């Protein structure tokens, strides 16, 4: 038969507890500008290798897992599409420094 | 009713005009030259000119220097910020205990800021646009205004609005019988939804048909809010803006504490300064009560040396009770009050004295009075003879389970047979630790 | 023969504190058993904790081990009943790594306190009959539609605002399915289905997916009431899903500035009716090893209106008080014993340990000899009060073995030879103390 | 078969029918006091009546004291949980002492639920794609009919889906040829495999076939698993599972043990007495086995008060060698067994004693017989007076060596040469030590 | 009124040291009165600061309590001026829970260097003329003026973009970098129309742009060491320069940092604006912190270090043992020792009659030599404070001048560190903990 | 590199993208180029149309919009677009380099991976990054790769020293540890 009640919190008790502050201090730099004017900047690191991922080798996986993984990495995917490309921007590293224009007059 | 608390009888320092202490007033009874001290200090706070400047209140325990400290509270009102801590409070998992006390030396300074804006508001009933053919030149047909009509309940006007604001316009999706908001220095519109008019027996949306406004469809609305510099660094530290993944990532990791920089605190006194100089925050420097400092650490302390010599400080208030104890954090140092000299040097002293049996009789008809009861006056005299023998404050905690006694015995006054079988059903600090030889 | 999971404990024979009306004390009543003083002084305070008017009022119970202490706690936990708070720990459960003493403490006051808040529900419900909703045809009219529902005796027809027919259809709506909507809101749920096909069944093979019909008009105005902590409103405030550290425990330190405005908040609930606040009870045994630091944040902790009633319990004379190198009583500091009450407990009689006995017979279901009872009264007298209360189920298991129906004298013999009390071990441990290691 | 372990030839108790212990059986020999108030309480943990009674096994090294506490495993059988634990296990990075000992206390108790799985199970004949009949009038495009057919070894049988469970098996790209698994009365689908007679349907795969099931289609059978904390108390701390965004992203954060509240543990215990009043769930109280108990700290025993005092909580046995020594964490307050004296009246002794000269040439005889090692009566004999001379162990260690040196001599049994070239090259901890005392 | 968030703390009233162009100290100037060996040593190590060449060079000032060391660090702040850095910490502040003491003393370190980065940028500003789009791709037209000269640009389409985010219409004058087209927006020149209803605003006016419209300008940046490790420390690591999440930044970061500063320095883009860290009571760092402080000074972006202590022979924290000033010997012989005299009746009525300046306060002369006195029978800081209760007493009675009579009133009432440890002797067995 | 005269992708069911067909202009020559959907969402990264000059680097996938061509720039009088000239070489180089590194380095990039593609990658990217410790197994297996590239020609060995001042700051475990350390074949002086 079916199971009924035992949700302990319920829903409406964290409706009623509903618990109902800006400024300029991301000036940084000084001489006002936008934080990331500043940043772009003096952001010249990159790591010295890189790497990608290890990865699990077995000759012959077994279905749960690879079922397992293919729902979570499609779930991913999926729910991250609306945050994605902001996402993968925050998130990816800086591999190549590239000579300043200027360099080319001072030298 | 309210529930009742320890210091819940303390309304004020009652002292005079000329701040001389009344011997009986606003629920305290004696300490006249400590009551006068903290006069001083509440005019002090009031003056608005000092920062850092820091007192302690001294002496043994149960001489109301905790009830000094909360009458300074009463006496300054709920403008002025008021901050407890206990010393033990600085040990966080989260955050080092110098962190800790900055965190409070800020929540101790308030901010009112008191923007302004003016807005229209009401029923659209035009969306109406305007015509004068052609922009001087090669044309199909040009607006050069938007005819906009308002009404909510006062009356009815129309405002001829720049043509630019149709993009934002239909942005917001508003149609006749909307009910809008526009704010007259970005000309920004907003809609609310629309009117109750539409309503009242359909139902059945989320948008709810917000209820036709009140009042004119001109309004200049002064908004005050209170706000401490603690709440701008906290708010100015964290990355808020949900259109980022990290800002929901942070939903599920744990949102701990964290040692806010000095930097930070530089920009926010910077534009907080230029608020101040602009005209739309006004600066309320408050105080920092620290009950059981003795609780707290030679680094603590050797950090508060710093801290009160800043000009940003707010006023500070400590109080301890211990003698010549070791500090903590030392292995072997000794100091008076359990404080390192150096800090002592740094605070003025308010001592507090033990009480005589009339005044400790006198406080027990307060807390009687404050709590309901109705005493007689041998009970009130062998309480007081109790209170004498014992420590005040077990004589105060005798009242209410008495008059619980009482009750229960039908009577509504608490005679002497009730507090003295109360006194033997409960024991004291003192004659529990003669038992204790007793009973090892 | 069933076994649930509350099963025979150490205080599981006391239901209350055993007193009259005027808070006098019975012999022996509620499993309790002498303490006549110290049960008095329980019934006053519990008399205090019932009021509820006066806050930070603190309370010790001192007195020798196997005093009945925790008893006499146990017994105003159980007459005080449910519907008012009693959190009991121990006083070393504080110490965690994840949140700092006072942070636990902090918690540990404001679990105590309870909070019942009243909701009035404005909904809708009902069964659907039928549904017709347009096709697209540009604008807001692509989604204009019409909702059926019927109830018991009435049914009635609902136009739709274009934006709730996806989540119907996100839901799988079923004709004659059962649904209920909060007004202004919308919000859609799901309760059951009815199954039309078959009547009269439930339970078994058929119509086992039915849930109930509904039974009135639709406009179901009712009042629900929500009891809920202080400590549960600070953690769902502190998180965008906090609540589920309520669960885990996975609370950080809670700022202070949310605490400060819930109680504002509850006190605008509390004048404006809304809603109304039970403080109940701390209960802390073992507070002798409670830090320096702690008792100092309960001396300022105890003075807050929105503070509950703190019991606490001890055992030892005087001790050091931990985190410093000094000696007190109680190993508490003086500055907070001036803020307690202190009720003893004295040691047990002949009369009163037979008594005890006999109730804990009678709680594990024991029968034994008059000759049993009072050996082994004169072995609780001479070893200890618990050292004889552990033997009667042992010996009753060796009568059960010997396929007894009482136990003799015999068997308390045999049981005392079997398992040895601390005095008796410790001598046999000083006669092969050179086999025993690191002294 | 399995390695050999120190514990290996220890079987039960050794006790008759009337629980006496006999001179040597299963394994043991002597300790019979001890052996037979073990029996006592192996009859005290199968009455499944009482909570928190507490033992300690005490005595000198060597005495048998795991080896009573692992007999008592054994006798009692692998049903009933036994939670081994060691006193250092306590002092983690992640959660609280506390947390520590009441998750192990919950890890003792047991819960045997019972439940019937049913499933149809078969090659897929076809899915009848039937059409929707006349539209809903709400939405249209959907499904309703859907008969699935099935097909097994003995069997051939068709059924009616739910339109959504439909979906559910579309989204697997399921169609003929593909053995399914069809959960009876939940949503679950699997495709098992595609049918082993499709072998010449494609060149390659990536997929392996499956056979066709036998018996009925309609495969029914009932089950029973046995649970702890394992799946309701930290299932119910951080939620597996899900699928929003958050639980996904939790399923590959790190896993952390946090410090679970009491209140869930409460809701719990209500849940599983409600589930055990149905009938569906048996409650199966089991033991914790806290062996080196002298290395808790003081917080800890003071914890272990108030956990012993529950009425839900499981029957525990204590293990500690040491004399009169410090109590850790107290710094100067020394008690017998390094145990507090408080925590020592709540629990039952058992003393073990040390062994005789005939004893020990049992045992080391016995330890032979187990790891499969012939000896001679001489050699038995040297090494038993070895044992009294150093120690029990030490001799049952110079065992193995000794067979290995006689297998590289070509002997097929231990010679008093073998046993006393190991003995030559292997040096005791009273010999060591000597030779540091010396230089 | 207007009470701005710097209020009179204590030592607002110090300005500078006081000292002549050739660094020998005057008696009172700039706040600053006695203590002229110690100012004058101030000044050469001012002067060490200012020269920038010598790396890693540590002083330490020492003296009784009360002497004015503070004093002597903020006169240094003052006078050394807010474009180089000057950072300022306890001893305390290190022991963090989110970093080690070595990284902490890295970061402020690092805190106290500045690269002031210098680049080349063009700009367009002028006053906007006329502006048009033709929305449906988008293609518009833009005019600019200036008082010289007038321009009309035909646009792209994200420079279409960007006018239109920033909503910009004619009578702005505004600045477009030439760079990647961000626009700022300076003012209006020209009103809005007043036939538009409820857009009236009325702001402030700003003038036309002069010269050429396209101009092209040095600007500088100024950036210390340590926000160029927290930048790099991570992605999206520039929040914790305001959280202070900085938890163990990598040494590699630091190396290549380190190498790319010194290139932009030979590339003519930066230069090293070495400044001070100043350590206020030295005595609570651990002996692992002065053992790291003994190798972080040998460094060439090392700063200025200035510290503070009061100690005699006095315990090393985290040791068993003794040495002067609670230091150990390896670090003491690295540094220089600045010592502070007591001050003397004059230097102590000086002090008071500048503070009593900084806070508003007229006091009769005897009142001052009554203060005077009590200052030097107690404490100088207690004579101090004293000043502003009197003048509040004074208020209250409403008189004009601080008198004698408000300062034994004030001296009854608040109690300095002697009088109340005698009486607590008195009631030393109502006190706890003895 | 070059500027990219077209990009279209090529998507089918097994829906998604197969990969993507870009092309490629230089100075001395055109190319046309299939390429990984990883690189294609890496080429939406920098927001990449037709007509801008790019770099990719294969071995990391690595993208760089320099700009676009100074072809375009006499077409707008104001552009926010930043102008790049065409690039003269190949459009297709193949270059050999020498990279100094640690062993450090190469345990920290395998230990804490960051130059992954997958989602699950970017996901744990998200956490605070931390000092972890280590494993032997890690190390073992960088050392194996690196003798690998020792015996193929590929790499030099370059060991170095390590100069640990005020060593008596270390506690015993330090100085125990060190036995063990200062015993291994691959320490350094």
Known sequence: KTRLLKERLDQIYLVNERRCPSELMLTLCRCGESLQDVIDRVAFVIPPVVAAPPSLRVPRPPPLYSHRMRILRQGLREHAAPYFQQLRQTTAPRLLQFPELRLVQFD | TQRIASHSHVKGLGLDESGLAKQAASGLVGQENAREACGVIVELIKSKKMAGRAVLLAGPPGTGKTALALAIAQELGSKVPFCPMVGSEVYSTEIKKTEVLMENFRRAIGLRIKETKEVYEGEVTELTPCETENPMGGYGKTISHVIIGLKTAKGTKQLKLDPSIFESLQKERVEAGDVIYIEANSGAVKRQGRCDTYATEFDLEAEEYVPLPKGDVHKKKEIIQDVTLHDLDVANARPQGGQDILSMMGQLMKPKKTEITDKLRGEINKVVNKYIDQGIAELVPGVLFVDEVHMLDIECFTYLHRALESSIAPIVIFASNRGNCVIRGTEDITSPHGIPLDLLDRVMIIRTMLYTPQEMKQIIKIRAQTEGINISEEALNHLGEIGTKTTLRYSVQLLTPANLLAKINGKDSIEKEHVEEISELFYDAKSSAKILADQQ | ?439
């Open chain 3, 1 to 439: 023969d069933v076994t649930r999971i509350e099963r025979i404990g150490a205080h599981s024979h006391i239901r209350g504190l055993g007193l009259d009306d005027a808070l006098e004390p019975r012999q022996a009543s509620q499993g309790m058993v002498g303490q006549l003083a110290a049960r008095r002084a329980a019934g006053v305070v519990l008399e205090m904790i019932r009021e509820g008017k006066i806050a930070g009022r603190a309370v010790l119970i001192a007195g020798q081990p196997g005093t009945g202490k925790t008893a006499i706690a146990m017994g105003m936990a159980q007459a005080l009943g449910p519907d008012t708070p009693f959190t009991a720990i121990a006083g070393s459960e504080i110490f965690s790594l994840e949140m700092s003493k006072t942070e636990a403490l902090t918690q540990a006051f404001r679990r105590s306190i309870g909070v019942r808040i009243k909701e009035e529900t404005e909904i809708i419900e009902g069964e659907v009959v039928e549904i017709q909703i347009d096709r697209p045809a540009t604008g807001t009219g692509s989604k204009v539609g019409k909702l059926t529902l019927k109830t018991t005796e009435m049914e009635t027809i609902y136009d739709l605002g274009t934006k709730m027919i996806e989540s119907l259809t996100k839901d799988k709506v079923q004709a004659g399915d059962v649904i209920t909507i909060d007004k202004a809101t919308g919000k859609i749920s799901k309760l059951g289905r009815s199954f039309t096909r078959a009547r009269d069944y439930d339970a078994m093979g058929s119509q086992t997916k039915f849930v109930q019909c509904p039974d009135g008009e639709l406009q179901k105005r009712k009042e629900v009431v929500h009891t809920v902590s202080l400590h549960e409103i600070d953690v769902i405030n502190s998180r965008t899903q906090g609540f589920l550290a309520l669960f885990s425990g996975d609370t950080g330190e809670i700022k202070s500035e949310v605490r400060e405005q819930i109680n504002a908040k509850v006190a605008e609930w509390r004048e404006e009716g809304k809603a109304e606040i039970i403080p109940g009870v701390l209960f802390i045994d073992e507070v002798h090893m409670l830090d320096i630091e702690s008792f100092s944040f309960l001396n300022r902790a105890l003075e807050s209106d929105m503070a509950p009633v703190l019991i606490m319990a001890t055992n030892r004379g005087i001790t050091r008080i931990r985190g410093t190198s000094y000696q007190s009583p109680h190993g508490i500091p003086i500055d907070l014993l001036d803020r307690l009450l202190i009720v003893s407990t004295t040691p047990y009689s002949e009369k009163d340990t037979k008594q005890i006995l006999r109730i804990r017979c009678e709680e594990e279901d024991v029968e034994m000899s008059e000759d049993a009872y009072t050996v082994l009264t004169r072995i609780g007298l001479e070893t200890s009060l618990r050292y004889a209360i552990q033997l009667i189920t042992a010996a009753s298991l060796v009568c059960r073995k010997r396929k007894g129906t009482e136990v003799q004298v015999d068997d308390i013999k045999r049981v005392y030879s079997l398992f040895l009390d601390e005095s008796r071990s410790t001598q046999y441990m000083k006669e092969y103390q050179d086999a025993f290691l690191f002294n």
